[PDB]
Structure 1
Amino acid sequence: DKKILVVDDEKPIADILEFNLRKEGYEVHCAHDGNEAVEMVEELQPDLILLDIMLPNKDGVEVCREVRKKYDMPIIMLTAKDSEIDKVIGLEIGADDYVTKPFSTRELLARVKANLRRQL
């Protein structure tokens, strides 16, 4: 089972992601802040991270940079629909993809699989 780390401060969003991902058959662990995420990354070595761009402490942008100093597993940012820059910025700083909130399940699961499979 592919291991996914869901990093989100809003429990209902983190929980609906964890629900859909476990259902599809992933092993899912949840972090609710920045530093806890970087810790969990070293212990679990997730296959993919879903990272809120708007974490309140250490930003998703800083989580991403700090993770990338050591690890290259796929990172997908979670962003609002209404901010172009939030979608764009993660791809400049080392994330692989983004999914917008609210997301369809359909799109979440495609994006996670496609990023798990991505070429070379």
Structure 2
Amino acid sequence: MRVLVVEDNALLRHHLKVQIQDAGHQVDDAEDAKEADYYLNEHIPDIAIVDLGLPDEDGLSLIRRWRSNDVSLPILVLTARESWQDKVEVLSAGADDYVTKPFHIEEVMARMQALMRRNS
């Protein structure tokens, strides 16, 4: 499967990509929202991991905009924000799931896997 990772922190972004690659997937890694639009349009990914703290455009704005254009793939959010209202808001904007920071990387892998399993 093809995974799009959108993550502003270079080190995290690279870690994500190599772990997901090592599990047998192809990964596009974008560092901001507009770059995310770049990968989205070039190859439709099967799944996207989106950090909300993008320097470009907030991740919620990004999810909203994709959904409102009938982009329907599963999206797993990475987020600093962790109140229960934040989580309702994120889900309500079109995300399928979220992981709160700080996180272990095996937690994102496990969430991504569960969406992949459902999706396919």
Q: With the length of structure 2 as denominator, give the TM-score of the two structures.
A: 0.88
Once the two structures are TM-superposed, the CA of residue 15 in structure 1 deviates from its matched residue by 1.0
Q: Hey, what does 2:41 align to over in structure 1? A: 42
The CA distance in 1 between the partners of 2:119 and 2:49, in whole Å, is 19
Cα shift readout 1:51-110 (whole Å, capped 9, x = no counterpart): 011112211011111211231100011012x62244332101001001122322332222
What is the rounded CA distance, in whole Å, between the counterparts of 1:73 and 1:58 in structure 2?
A: 20
List runs of 5+ in structure 2 lacking aligned partners.
none
Tell me how large the CA RMSD over aligned residues is.
Answer: 1.8
Cα distance in 2 for partners of 1:62, 1:21 equals 26
Identity of aligned residues (%): 39
The amino acid across from 1:114 in the alignment is A
Q: Give distance in 1, aligned partners of 2:119 and 2:6.
A: 25
TM-score, normalised relative to structure 1: 0.88
- For 1:16 and 1:7, locate their aligned partners in 2 and report how far apart those are by CA, in whole Å: 12
For 2:104, the equivalent position in structure 1 comes to 104
Q: Does structure 1 conserve the Cα–Cα contact (< 8 Å) formed by 2:82 and 2:100?
A: no
Distance 1:10 1:113 in 2: 22
| Number of the residue aligned with 1:115 | 115
